[PDB]
Symmetry: D2
């Protein structure tokens, strides 16, 4: 199941992308 999240702001997107990528690797 794939979901899209709309993120406002460049830095906010980069933070949430990093967290997403981290969780993908760690889970």
């Amino acid at each position: 199941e794939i979901f899209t999240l709309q993120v406002r702001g460049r830095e906010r997107y980069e933070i949430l992308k990093k967290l997403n990528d981290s969780l993908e690797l760690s889970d």
Copy 2:
């Protein structure tokens, strides 16, 4: 208020989406970053 720019993040799995949505919603309200 806040940034005018918008970017789509793809998330795999409901649990992970819920965590990230919670953070995203928090940041929209607080505007910390």
Copy 3:
């Protein structure tokens, strides 16, 4: 008072991210 917990965070940028999230959640909660 709300009880204080600590996390040891490795790296300045990692710390800065988690601090911003902490502060955001304090404000939105």
Copy 4:
């Protein structure tokens, strides 16, 4: 470089701990 993050309350602590633990395993940042 280790930074100590202070967090108020269990709910925020557990979210941030999950993230910190993930980041330690992945080293994304």
